Amino acid sequence: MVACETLKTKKMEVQIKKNFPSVLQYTMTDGKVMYGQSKDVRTVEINGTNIELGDDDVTFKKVSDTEATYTLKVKDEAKKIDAVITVQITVKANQLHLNVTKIKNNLSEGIPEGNGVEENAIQTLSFPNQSLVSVRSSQENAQFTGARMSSNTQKPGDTNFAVTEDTNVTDSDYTYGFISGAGLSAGLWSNSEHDGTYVAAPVRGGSQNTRVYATTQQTGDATSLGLASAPWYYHRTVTDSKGKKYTVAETALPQMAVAIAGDENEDGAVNWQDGAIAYRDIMNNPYKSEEVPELVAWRIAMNFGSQAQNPFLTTLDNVKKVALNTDGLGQSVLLKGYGNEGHDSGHPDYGDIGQRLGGADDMNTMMEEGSKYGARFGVHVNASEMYPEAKAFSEDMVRRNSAGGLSYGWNWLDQGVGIDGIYDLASGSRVSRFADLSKEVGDNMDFIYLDVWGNLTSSGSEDSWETRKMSKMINDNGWRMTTEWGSGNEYDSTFQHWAADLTYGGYTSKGENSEVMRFLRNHQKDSWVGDYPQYGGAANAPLLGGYNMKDFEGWQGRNDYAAYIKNLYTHDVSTKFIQHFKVTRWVNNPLLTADNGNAAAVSDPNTNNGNEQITLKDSNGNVVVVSRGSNDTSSAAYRQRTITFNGVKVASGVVSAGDGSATGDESYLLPWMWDSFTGKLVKDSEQKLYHWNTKGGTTTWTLPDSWKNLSSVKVYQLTDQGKTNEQTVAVSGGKVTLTADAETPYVVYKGEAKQIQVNWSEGMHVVDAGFNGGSNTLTDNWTVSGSGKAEVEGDNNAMLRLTGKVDVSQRLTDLKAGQKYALYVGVDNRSTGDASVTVTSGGKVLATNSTGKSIAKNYIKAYGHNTNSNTENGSSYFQNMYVFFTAPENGDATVTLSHKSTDGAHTYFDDVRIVENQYSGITYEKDGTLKSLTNGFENNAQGIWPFVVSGSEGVEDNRIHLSELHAPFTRAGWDVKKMDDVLDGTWSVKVNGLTQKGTLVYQTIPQNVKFEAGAKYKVSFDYQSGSDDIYAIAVGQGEYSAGSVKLTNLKKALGETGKAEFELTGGVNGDSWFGIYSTATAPDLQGSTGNAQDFGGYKDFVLDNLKIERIESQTRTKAEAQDKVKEIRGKYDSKRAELSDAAWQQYQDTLVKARVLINKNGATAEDFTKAYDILVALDEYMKLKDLDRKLLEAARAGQDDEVRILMANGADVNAKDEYGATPLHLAAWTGHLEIVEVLLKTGADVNAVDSVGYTPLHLAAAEGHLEIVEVLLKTGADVNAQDAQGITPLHLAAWYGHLEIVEVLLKHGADVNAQDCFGKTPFDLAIDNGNEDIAEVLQKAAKLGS
């Protein structure tokens, strides 16, 4: 009978066809009608083939008055298609859902086990020109609005156009699509993982997901524009990098919907904004997006290269600090390096929680305890790059290129290899690794941060489909999705690092630039464009703000706590406040023009003088209206923004430019009316307002309706200690007057506010381990004793500062009796008197350790107290001091941090960490002196102990870490690998590519290994070095200064472990140490190309099984020692003139020290032996320092054979004079090619610089020795080496007039455009000295730069 049926709700009646799942029309309660597919279109697409259905191919069943079921017989024998598709059409309110509930393939039994290939798989499905909802040219105000992806601030992702007779579109794809006309508006939602047309995206991470297809057709006189879903993936067949094919099941069954809207925002018009309001009821919502508005304080807490810079319980104290300063506002901490050894270590072993940070135990304590303060935690994971050390590393996981070789990644600590994305998904390997992490964290962790997804490292695909499957794995474990790139994961991501950290990428690589996407989802994502004016467009004071992310916990060296907090109040409190409301109207957008495809864009001259305005509303009917001052970019008023909450002004002014260029004048009094948990409204006594005034001053405000009848308010200034300086401010006629300091946070309450209670250092075995508890932490938690002074000093990261004779002690809690512990503390000692750490059980000393004056600066970029943090006087010598003890059976255990000296100098202590440690390799003498120290690096609490990282790279994410065993991948011989990562056990100390640095890589320090003045020690270790003489052993005293060290070159030991052993005599000051020096010798890459040069291990150095043993020395008499003083004296007293002031003062120091030992009352043979061994060591040092002085003279004078014998006898090839000139500098400058070449073949630094920044090449080129210049360039000299003044060898060649030297320099890579610090090029320097000949040649060379 009738070929149509009627589905009905209280909001509309929909007429549907019985012969195909098609809507004829939607009729609202008010009579208004929207069309569907008015033509006989019965097309189904399977695998790219279109099949038109007959009357016999479709069966209909009206289930209810709100449901109908169809069965579509889709067949094409020729194209290998035979299927039964079950489509269900359901209605609810003003929504119509069309879902494919069942797919039956008659040409298949299904996907074979292990995701094998399904022959004749239904891979794709769509209904071409289904026209679920349509508008005609013949209808009043018939228009279309679409959105595509744009990460470019200058290019909007939107389209707004009128549907006219001329309109002709065919499957025009959009992320979102809305059609309006004849008083109604609707938008189509589909779950299609189709990738298509985008405006601007620098990556593929589901950035191109286009789910709506607009197509026009003729409906009589009119052109109808109809919306359909983009194709769906069912059983997609994919190929891995090794050519292996897989069939992977659906992420979800095909689903789509439409929501018909009238005048939803009740303005004049019916446009896409009405359709967008109704679309929110049918649209997909990212998992856990309902918590985004609460996440005020986003940051990164970083750990890298075995250093445990941020253990999990430390991160909880920083959560407690931020909570105090923000008065409990929600937080979101991304843990960058939560696993393995830290950041870019152990990928993709997601279930491996960093043992050195406190393992899964402390991570869960941090997470459980942190939730009480509104903090959410999440981990940084990588699904694209893998390291041989990761237990997931396999030949199947390895991404291979078309040639069958590795698809290498970045080499830093170890060499990264690309993961096979398709294998990792199809094998179900990734789900298994996420599950491992899920087993560790349970329901405690909040989010996952997926790094690099979209940059085509795992596949050349990484499409929306793959991203959807990825987001599902993560969501399935109860985790919110966050990713790297701004355009990435349109569907499921709630945060993009390159959208939230505005610093990164530049104006083309930011967040989602769309009025449509932000209107819909602003309150669900931190994936937008915020204020960063130097990008222009969307980044010039967006009205809705935008997350501006700063950090203070090591991420990229970032550690300014005050800057972090000031930024939260400047941009993020207002951004988050706005995310508590949903956009309802958005008119007069200055970015939308007729020239960028937005001719029909929403313009109201009766709203905000015709300038931009956004109206947002919430479920309780609260209205926020954010209005722009002027729409003219050249106006001062373009950056003026007023915010009203229920008609009352709450924020006003210009924000400080997000690029930190220019401060503003913005002042606000924002009503924060939500809890930091579910975001539920809080009770009246819990209701508060946040005050901020950028410029400082006095401002008058109207309080919200709720507060109008109060006679007074209570105002508190917020600090690192919480609510301070309580003020009682009167209320007159519902208005308050607040005096604010510039850029200072205040919180306003209706009455007296109870202070948030913070118990510092929970589970840390001590209370206030980080000294964050103010000046009163020394009264309440730590107990100070002594004549001296103990202060909590530090305006950023607080520290304990000791001056004079003082002891700071505290009782240790919750230690397991009989169990082995390691207690370490950061120490920077500027006093000459000892700084100590002691553990005691009822007066008895369990363990003790001490440092004299600190000798090594801190070079750990991700550590709070590195030498760029200015602990005192522009440096930081912070290094950890350890005590190893066994927890007492009685329970009584106490820690004391002492300074013994009466010396006015300061000692700095921070981060007392008591951790379970099974290390037991230190043996002491009868006196508390070192007898023996052994370490296989198997129980290192943290770092490369007893060693510390030196400054070969400066303040950096150092390429030194504890390397982990994973045979066969970490052993020599796998692929192009030639060195073993681990020598003995599971751990070693790896150095990656730190060659030709000419300086110290790492060294022991006296607070780690103390060498007694005059004592003999035998030092031995197992090692592997990629080349001959690239690394060397250094032996020195006190702070490192070049030339003061005794260097022993280490021979090549590649693939087969070598053994190094030597003797050491403790220096008189007890400041003796040994380490690993990077020479100036170039590595032998042995024919290796590209990545094989880095992976081969030709430039690496692995050390293991260290053994420091005090040894017996041949016994001397007072006479033998006294006789040696005469020998030394009548050898070097005659050189007073020939030596420096400091060189002679240390010679006297040592001699006096040795003479104290000999002449001491009651001295014994140990004293006479020590005095003799000190003098023997002094002799060997003086002798080699005179061999360096004599080599610098023979390079200057010209003696060939003399330079050779001095060198043969051990004179330093890189010795420096008073001006920092090496023998190679002095030979190149006085013109001796013979000396230069032999010096180069020996291992002289061809790029060594003097005080002024001259390389030997600069001195050679300035003097005109062209044969020397040619040798230097061939032996590896930088042709573009710059002076302190910016002078290059080309400038000096040009000014001094050496035509031939100029031509050879520019024959090699010399830049002719290169300018000094005074803008002069080599050409300008030639036209000043009269070398017009040189100037003409130089002019000609620059000309060719076209």
Partner: peptide
Amino acid sequence: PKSIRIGPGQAFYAX
């Protein structure tokens, strides 16, 4: 101005 002749520790701009 611009140094007479440069060498070890002798900057190009000394006056």
